[PDB]
Short mmCIF file of N, CA and C in Angstrom, two decimals:
data_model
loop_
_atom_site.label_atom_id
_atom_site.label_comp_id
_atom_site.label_asym_id
_atom_site.label_seq_id
_atom_site.Cartn_x
_atom_site.Cartn_y
_atom_site.Cartn_z
N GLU A 1 92.47 104.71 84.66
CA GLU A 1 92.52 105.13 86.06
C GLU A 1 91.65 104.22 86.93
N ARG A 2 91.68 102.93 86.64
CA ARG A 2 90.90 101.96 87.39
C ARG A 2 91.72 101.37 88.54
N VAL A 3 91.13 101.34 89.73
CA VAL A 3 91.80 100.80 90.90
C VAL A 3 91.07 99.57 91.44
N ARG A 4 91.82 98.49 91.64
CA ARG A 4 91.25 97.25 92.15
C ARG A 4 92.07 96.72 93.32
N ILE A 5 91.39 96.46 94.44
CA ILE A 5 92.06 95.94 95.63
C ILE A 5 91.40 94.65 96.11
N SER A 6 92.21 93.61 96.25
CA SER A 6 91.71 92.31 96.70
C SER A 6 92.24 91.97 98.09
N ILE A 7 91.34 91.68 99.02
CA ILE A 7 91.72 91.34 100.38
C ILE A 7 91.45 89.87 100.67
N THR A 8 92.41 89.21 101.31
CA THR A 8 92.27 87.80 101.65
C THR A 8 92.14 87.61 103.16
N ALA A 9 90.90 87.52 103.63
CA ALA A 9 90.63 87.33 105.05
C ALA A 9 90.21 85.90 105.35
N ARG A 10 90.16 85.55 106.63
CA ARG A 10 89.77 84.21 107.05
C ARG A 10 88.30 83.95 106.73
N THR A 11 87.43 84.80 107.27
CA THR A 11 86.00 84.66 107.05
C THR A 11 85.42 85.90 106.36
N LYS A 12 84.19 85.78 105.88
CA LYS A 12 83.52 86.89 105.20
C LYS A 12 83.41 88.10 106.13
N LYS A 13 83.09 87.85 107.39
CA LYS A 13 82.95 88.91 108.37
C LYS A 13 84.24 89.72 108.49
N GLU A 14 85.37 89.03 108.40
CA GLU A 14 86.67 89.69 108.49
C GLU A 14 86.91 90.60 107.29
N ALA A 15 86.73 90.05 106.10
CA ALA A 15 86.93 90.81 104.87
C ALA A 15 85.94 91.98 104.79
N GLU A 16 84.71 91.74 105.23
CA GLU A 16 83.68 92.77 105.21
C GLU A 16 84.12 94.00 105.99
N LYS A 17 84.77 93.77 107.13
CA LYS A 17 85.24 94.86 107.98
C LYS A 17 86.24 95.73 107.23
N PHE A 18 87.03 95.11 106.35
CA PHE A 18 88.02 95.84 105.57
C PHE A 18 87.36 96.60 104.43
N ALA A 19 86.41 95.96 103.77
CA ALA A 19 85.70 96.57 102.65
C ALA A 19 85.07 97.89 103.07
N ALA A 20 84.44 97.90 104.24
CA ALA A 20 83.79 99.10 104.75
C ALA A 20 84.74 100.29 104.72
N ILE A 21 85.95 100.08 105.22
CA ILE A 21 86.96 101.14 105.25
C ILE A 21 87.39 101.54 103.84
N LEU A 22 87.71 100.54 103.03
CA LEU A 22 88.14 100.78 101.65
C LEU A 22 87.12 101.65 100.91
N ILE A 23 85.84 101.41 101.18
CA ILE A 23 84.78 102.17 100.54
C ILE A 23 84.92 103.66 100.83
N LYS A 24 85.16 104.00 102.09
CA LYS A 24 85.32 105.39 102.50
C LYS A 24 86.56 106.00 101.85
N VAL A 25 87.67 105.28 101.91
CA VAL A 25 88.92 105.76 101.33
C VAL A 25 88.76 106.05 99.84
N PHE A 26 88.02 105.19 99.15
CA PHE A 26 87.78 105.35 97.72
C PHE A 26 86.83 106.52 97.46
N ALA A 27 85.78 106.61 98.27
CA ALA A 27 84.80 107.68 98.12
C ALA A 27 85.43 109.04 98.35
N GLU A 28 86.24 109.15 99.40
CA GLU A 28 86.91 110.41 99.72
C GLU A 28 87.97 110.74 98.68
N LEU A 29 88.38 109.74 97.91
CA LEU A 29 89.39 109.92 96.88
C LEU A 29 88.75 110.25 95.54
N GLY A 30 87.42 110.29 95.52
CA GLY A 30 86.70 110.60 94.30
C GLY A 30 86.41 109.36 93.47
N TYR A 31 86.63 108.19 94.06
CA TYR A 31 86.39 106.93 93.37
C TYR A 31 85.00 106.39 93.68
N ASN A 32 84.04 107.30 93.84
CA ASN A 32 82.67 106.92 94.14
C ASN A 32 82.17 105.86 93.16
N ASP A 33 81.11 105.16 93.53
CA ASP A 33 80.53 104.13 92.68
C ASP A 33 81.45 102.91 92.62
N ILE A 34 81.74 102.33 93.78
CA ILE A 34 82.61 101.16 93.85
C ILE A 34 81.81 99.87 93.69
N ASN A 35 82.44 98.86 93.12
CA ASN A 35 81.79 97.57 92.91
C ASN A 35 82.62 96.44 93.51
N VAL A 36 82.00 95.66 94.40
CA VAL A 36 82.68 94.55 95.05
C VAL A 36 82.29 93.22 94.40
N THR A 37 83.29 92.38 94.16
CA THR A 37 83.06 91.08 93.54
C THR A 37 83.78 89.97 94.30
N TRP A 38 83.01 89.08 94.90
CA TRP A 38 83.57 87.97 95.66
C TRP A 38 83.40 86.65 94.92
N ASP A 39 84.40 85.78 95.02
CA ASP A 39 84.36 84.48 94.35
C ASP A 39 84.98 83.40 95.23
N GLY A 40 84.13 82.63 95.90
CA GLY A 40 84.62 81.57 96.77
C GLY A 40 84.84 82.04 98.19
N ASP A 41 85.99 82.65 98.44
CA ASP A 41 86.32 83.15 99.77
C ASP A 41 87.21 84.38 99.69
N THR A 42 87.23 85.01 98.52
CA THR A 42 88.05 86.20 98.31
C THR A 42 87.21 87.36 97.78
N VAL A 43 87.37 88.53 98.39
CA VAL A 43 86.63 89.71 97.97
C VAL A 43 87.56 90.75 97.35
N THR A 44 87.15 91.28 96.20
CA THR A 44 87.94 92.29 95.50
C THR A 44 87.10 93.51 95.17
N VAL A 45 87.58 94.68 95.60
CA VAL A 45 86.87 95.93 95.34
C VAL A 45 87.34 96.57 94.04
N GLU A 46 86.40 97.11 93.27
CA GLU A 46 86.72 97.75 92.00
C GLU A 46 86.16 99.17 91.96
N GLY A 47 87.05 100.14 91.80
CA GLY A 47 86.63 101.53 91.74
C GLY A 47 87.19 102.26 90.54
N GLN A 48 86.54 103.35 90.15
CA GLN A 48 86.98 104.13 89.00
C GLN A 48 86.94 105.62 89.31
N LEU A 49 87.94 106.35 88.83
CA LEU A 49 88.03 107.79 89.06
C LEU A 49 87.67 108.56 87.79
N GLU A 50 86.92 109.65 87.96
CA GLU A 50 86.52 110.48 86.83
C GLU A 50 87.36 111.75 86.76
N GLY A 51 88.64 111.63 87.10
CA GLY A 51 89.52 112.78 87.07
C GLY A 51 90.85 112.51 87.75
N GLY A 52 91.73 111.80 87.04
CA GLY A 52 93.03 111.48 87.60
C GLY A 52 93.85 110.58 86.68
N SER A 53 94.89 111.15 86.09
CA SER A 53 95.75 110.40 85.18
C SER A 53 97.21 110.85 85.30
N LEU A 54 98.13 109.98 84.90
CA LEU A 54 99.55 110.29 84.97
C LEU A 54 100.13 110.51 83.57
N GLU A 55 99.67 111.57 82.91
CA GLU A 55 100.14 111.89 81.57
C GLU A 55 101.66 112.01 81.54
N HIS A 56 102.26 111.64 80.41
CA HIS A 56 103.71 111.71 80.26
C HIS A 56 104.13 111.25 78.86
N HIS A 57 105.00 112.03 78.22
CA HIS A 57 105.48 111.69 76.89
C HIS A 57 104.31 111.47 75.93
N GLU B 1 95.29 84.26 111.99
CA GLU B 1 94.76 85.62 111.97
C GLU B 1 95.63 86.54 111.12
N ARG B 2 96.11 86.02 109.99
CA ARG B 2 96.96 86.79 109.09
C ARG B 2 96.12 87.48 108.02
N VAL B 3 96.26 88.80 107.92
CA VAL B 3 95.52 89.58 106.94
C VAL B 3 96.45 90.15 105.88
N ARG B 4 96.16 89.86 104.62
CA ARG B 4 96.97 90.35 103.51
C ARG B 4 96.10 91.00 102.44
N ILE B 5 96.48 92.20 102.02
CA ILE B 5 95.74 92.93 101.00
C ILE B 5 96.64 93.32 99.84
N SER B 6 96.24 92.94 98.63
CA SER B 6 97.01 93.25 97.44
C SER B 6 96.29 94.28 96.57
N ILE B 7 96.96 95.38 96.28
CA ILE B 7 96.38 96.44 95.46
C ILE B 7 97.07 96.52 94.10
N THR B 8 96.27 96.65 93.04
CA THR B 8 96.80 96.74 91.69
C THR B 8 96.56 98.13 91.09
N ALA B 9 97.60 98.95 91.08
CA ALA B 9 97.50 100.30 90.53
C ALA B 9 98.28 100.43 89.23
N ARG B 10 98.08 101.53 88.53
CA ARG B 10 98.76 101.78 87.27
C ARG B 10 100.25 102.02 87.50
N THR B 11 100.57 102.99 88.35
CA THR B 11 101.95 103.32 88.66
C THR B 11 102.26 103.07 90.13
N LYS B 12 103.55 102.98 90.45
CA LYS B 12 103.98 102.75 91.83
C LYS B 12 103.46 103.85 92.75
N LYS B 13 103.52 105.09 92.27
CA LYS B 13 103.05 106.23 93.05
C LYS B 13 101.58 106.07 93.43
N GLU B 14 100.80 105.48 92.52
CA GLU B 14 99.38 105.27 92.76
C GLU B 14 99.16 104.26 93.89
N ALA B 15 99.80 103.10 93.77
CA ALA B 15 99.68 102.06 94.78
C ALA B 15 100.20 102.54 96.13
N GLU B 16 101.32 103.25 96.11
CA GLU B 16 101.91 103.77 97.34
C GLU B 16 100.93 104.66 98.09
N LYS B 17 100.18 105.46 97.35
CA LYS B 17 99.20 106.36 97.95
C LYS B 17 98.15 105.58 98.74
N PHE B 18 97.85 104.37 98.28
CA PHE B 18 96.87 103.52 98.94
C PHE B 18 97.50 102.80 100.14
N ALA B 19 98.74 102.36 99.97
CA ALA B 19 99.45 101.66 101.03
C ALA B 19 99.49 102.49 102.31
N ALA B 20 99.76 103.78 102.16
CA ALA B 20 99.82 104.69 103.30
C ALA B 20 98.55 104.60 104.14
N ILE B 21 97.40 104.59 103.47
CA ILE B 21 96.12 104.51 104.15
C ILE B 21 95.93 103.15 104.82
N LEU B 22 96.17 102.09 104.06
CA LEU B 22 96.03 100.73 104.58
C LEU B 22 96.84 100.55 105.86
N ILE B 23 98.03 101.15 105.89
CA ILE B 23 98.90 101.05 107.06
C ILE B 23 98.23 101.66 108.29
N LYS B 24 97.58 102.80 108.10
CA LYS B 24 96.90 103.49 109.20
C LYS B 24 95.72 102.66 109.70
N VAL B 25 94.97 102.08 108.77
CA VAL B 25 93.81 101.26 109.12
C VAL B 25 94.24 100.01 109.88
N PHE B 26 95.34 99.41 109.45
CA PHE B 26 95.85 98.20 110.10
C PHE B 26 96.34 98.51 111.51
N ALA B 27 97.04 99.63 111.66
CA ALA B 27 97.56 100.04 112.95
C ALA B 27 96.44 100.30 113.95
N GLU B 28 95.41 101.02 113.50
CA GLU B 28 94.27 101.34 114.35
C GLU B 28 93.45 100.09 114.64
N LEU B 29 93.63 99.06 113.82
CA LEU B 29 92.90 97.81 113.99
C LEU B 29 93.66 96.86 114.91
N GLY B 30 94.89 97.23 115.25
CA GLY B 30 95.70 96.40 116.12
C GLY B 30 96.65 95.51 115.34
N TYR B 31 96.72 95.72 114.03
CA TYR B 31 97.60 94.92 113.18
C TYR B 31 98.94 95.61 112.98
N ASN B 32 99.41 96.28 114.02
CA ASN B 32 100.69 96.99 113.97
C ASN B 32 101.79 96.08 113.42
N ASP B 33 102.87 96.69 112.96
CA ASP B 33 104.00 95.94 112.41
C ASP B 33 103.62 95.27 111.09
N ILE B 34 103.29 96.09 110.10
CA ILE B 34 102.91 95.58 108.79
C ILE B 34 104.12 95.46 107.87
N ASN B 35 104.07 94.49 106.96
CA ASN B 35 105.16 94.27 106.02
C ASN B 35 104.66 94.28 104.58
N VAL B 36 105.24 95.16 103.77
CA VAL B 36 104.85 95.28 102.37
C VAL B 36 105.82 94.53 101.46
N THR B 37 105.28 93.79 100.50
CA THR B 37 106.10 93.03 99.57
C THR B 37 105.67 93.29 98.13
N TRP B 38 106.56 93.91 97.35
CA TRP B 38 106.27 94.21 95.96
C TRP B 38 107.08 93.31 95.03
N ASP B 39 106.46 92.88 93.94
CA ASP B 39 107.12 92.02 92.97
C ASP B 39 106.72 92.39 91.54
N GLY B 40 107.60 93.10 90.85
CA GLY B 40 107.32 93.50 89.49
C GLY B 40 106.59 94.83 89.42
N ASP B 41 105.27 94.78 89.56
CA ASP B 41 104.46 95.99 89.51
C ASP B 41 103.22 95.85 90.39
N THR B 42 103.29 94.93 91.35
CA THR B 42 102.18 94.69 92.26
C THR B 42 102.62 94.79 93.72
N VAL B 43 101.87 95.54 94.51
CA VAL B 43 102.19 95.72 95.93
C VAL B 43 101.15 95.03 96.81
N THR B 44 101.63 94.24 97.77
CA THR B 44 100.75 93.52 98.68
C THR B 44 101.17 93.74 100.13
N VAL B 45 100.23 94.19 100.95
CA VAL B 45 100.50 94.43 102.36
C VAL B 45 100.21 93.19 103.20
N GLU B 46 101.09 92.91 104.16
CA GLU B 46 100.93 91.75 105.03
C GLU B 46 100.94 92.17 106.49
N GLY B 47 99.85 91.86 107.20
CA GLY B 47 99.75 92.21 108.60
C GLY B 47 99.36 91.03 109.47
N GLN B 48 99.58 91.16 110.77
CA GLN B 48 99.24 90.09 111.71
C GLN B 48 98.45 90.64 112.89
N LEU B 49 97.75 89.75 113.59
CA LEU B 49 96.95 90.14 114.75
C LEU B 49 97.35 89.34 115.98
N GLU B 50 97.40 90.02 117.13
CA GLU B 50 97.77 89.37 118.38
C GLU B 50 96.55 89.14 119.26
N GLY B 51 95.44 88.76 118.63
CA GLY B 51 94.21 88.53 119.37
C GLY B 51 93.46 89.81 119.68
N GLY B 52 92.13 89.72 119.68
CA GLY B 52 91.32 90.89 119.96
C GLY B 52 91.68 91.55 121.27
N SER B 53 91.07 91.08 122.36
CA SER B 53 91.33 91.64 123.68
C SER B 53 90.90 93.10 123.75
N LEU B 54 90.72 93.60 124.97
CA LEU B 54 90.31 94.99 125.17
C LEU B 54 91.24 95.69 126.15
N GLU B 55 92.48 95.22 126.22
CA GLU B 55 93.48 95.81 127.11
C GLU B 55 93.85 97.22 126.65
N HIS B 56 94.89 97.78 127.27
CA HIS B 56 95.34 99.12 126.93
C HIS B 56 96.59 99.49 127.72
N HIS B 57 97.25 100.57 127.31
CA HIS B 57 98.46 101.03 127.98
C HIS B 57 98.43 102.54 128.19
#
């Protein structure tokens, strides 16, 4: 149940503005404890849920 | 000023749940008219900006 979202913005300031929102969306979704990892000019958010799966068969 | 965000979820339903939110954030940010492009099992949102400005209607 790991969720990872990568945003490609022009500058760090631009991507940062998006990360702020993503953090709230993840927190409100129960994906608290998010970890952001940037490499070069791309930022990717990594979150994990402690209660959410799509069981089947 | 092109902003693109790619989310990697387990199932389509999972990613779709995130897309809905991203769409709202983009619209409120002035990035109205967003285009989503999925290929295989990955969904990526594509939005554009028509300049900051502080106008209104």
